[PDB]
């Protein structure tokens, strides 16, 4: 009695945080698979989606 | 009427045109910034 919001997403268990991906935001974010070769320092932070 | 000071052949003592400033001092100079395009990958060269 008193739930503000419920919802559906990716199970933070089958997709473990250690050996594979990560989910703190909604998007399942992995580190370095497709990094844009030649840009500034703050870029590529979206190509990790 | 009135022949120009030259081509008449005699030395004289006439007038000039001057100003007040030191010119090079305003305490400033053209100050411009430039922003880099960004990526070298997607710059357009093909304008002919």
Looking at the complex, does the CB of residue A20 fall below 8 Å from at least one CB of chain B?
A: no
Q: Dihedral sign, CA of A47, A33, B43, B45? A: negative
Rounded to an integer, what distance in angstroms lies between the CA atom of residue B10 and that of residue B34? 58
Of A33, B33, A37, nearest in space to A48 by CA: A33
Of A22, A18, A29, A23, nearest in space to A7 by CA: A23
What is the stated resolution of the deposited model, in angstroms? 3.9
How many CB contacts within 8 angstroms connect chain A with chain B? 12
Are A36 and B41 a contacting pair at CB < 8 A? yes
**Contacts for A27 with CB less than 8 Å, ≥ 6 apart:** A49
Contact A41, A35 (CB under 8 A): no
Looking at the complex, does the CB of residue A31 fall below 8 Å from at least one CB of chain B?
A: no
Per-residue tokens: B33: 């910034």
């Amino acid at each position: 009695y008193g739930a503000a919001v419920v919802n559906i997403d990716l199970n933070r268990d089958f997709f473990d945080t250690a050996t594979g991906i990560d989910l703190t935001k909604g998007i399942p974010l992995v580190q370095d698979l497709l990094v844009p070769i030649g840009v500034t320092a703050g870029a590529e932070q979206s190509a990790e989606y | 009427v009135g022949i120009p000071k030259l081509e008449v052949d005699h030395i004289s003592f006439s007038n000039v045109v001057s100003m007040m400033t030191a010119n090079i001092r305003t305490g400033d100079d053209m100050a411009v910034e430039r922003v880099n395009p960004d990526d070298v990958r997607a710059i357009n060269i093909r304008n002919a």
